Amino acid sequence: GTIETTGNISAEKGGSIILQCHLSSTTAQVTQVNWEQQDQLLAICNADLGWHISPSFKDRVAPGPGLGLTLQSLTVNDTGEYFCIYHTYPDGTYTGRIFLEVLES
């Protein structure tokens, strides 16, 4: 299969952005999705355990919609790459990348 993302996206300072990825061309069960901002963990959506949000993003992330993540109160420090890491049963990994530019405002 393959992972499709919005690619390069823009958002206004103080606004919100929905980070989303779509896994296509595989019927394998998605067991977990991790979200990273650059090399830092934002959140984990595990099919059984739900949503883990890292303490530094607790007040700024709204889990979902679905396997996506809503990042709120954007600042210029949120500009950069984000990754969605899909885990598929039994042992697969698919990684998508999004580049966000936060504009002043």
Partner 1 sequence: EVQLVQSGAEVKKPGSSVKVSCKASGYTFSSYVMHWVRQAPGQGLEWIGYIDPYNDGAKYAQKFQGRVTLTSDKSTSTAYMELSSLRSEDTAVYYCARGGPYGWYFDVWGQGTTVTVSSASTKGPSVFPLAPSSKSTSGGTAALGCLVKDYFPEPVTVSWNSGALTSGVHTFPAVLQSSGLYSLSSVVTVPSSSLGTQTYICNVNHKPSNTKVDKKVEPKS
Partner 2 sequence: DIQMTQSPSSLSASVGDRVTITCRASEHIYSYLSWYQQKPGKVPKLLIYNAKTLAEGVPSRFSGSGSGTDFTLTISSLQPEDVATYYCQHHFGSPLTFGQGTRLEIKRTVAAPSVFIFPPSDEQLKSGTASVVCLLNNFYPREAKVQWKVDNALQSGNSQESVTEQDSKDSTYSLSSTLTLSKADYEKHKVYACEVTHQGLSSPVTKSFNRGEC
Kindly list the residues in this chain that would bind partner 1 in the complex (CB under 8 A): 41, 44, 46, 49-50, 52-56, 58
Q: Which is nearer to partner 2, 91 or 104 (CB)?
A: 91
Per-residue x/- track, 17-56, partner 2 (CB under 8 A): --------------xx-------------xxxx-------
Q: How near is the Cβ of 100 to partner 1 at its closest, in Å? A: 22
Q: Which is nearer to partner 2, 5 or 32 (CB)?
A: 32
Cα angle, residue 84 at apex, residues 78 and 90 outer, rounded to 5°:
160
How far is 78 from 16, CA to CA, in rounded Å?
11
The Cβ of residue 44 has, within 10 Å, a number of other Cβ atoms equal to 19
Complete edge-to-edge strand list for the sheet that includes strand 69-71? 17-19, 69-71, 61-63
Q: Please check whether residue 69 is in contact with residue 42, taking contact to mean a CB–CB distance below 8 angstroms.
A: yes
Q: Which is nearer to partner 2, 49 or 77 (CB)?
A: 49
Stretch that binds partner 2, among 4-12, 13-21, 66-74, 87-95 (CB under 8 A): 87-95
Q: Please check whether residue 23 is in contact with residue 7, taking contact to mean a CB–CB distance below 8 angstroms.
A: no
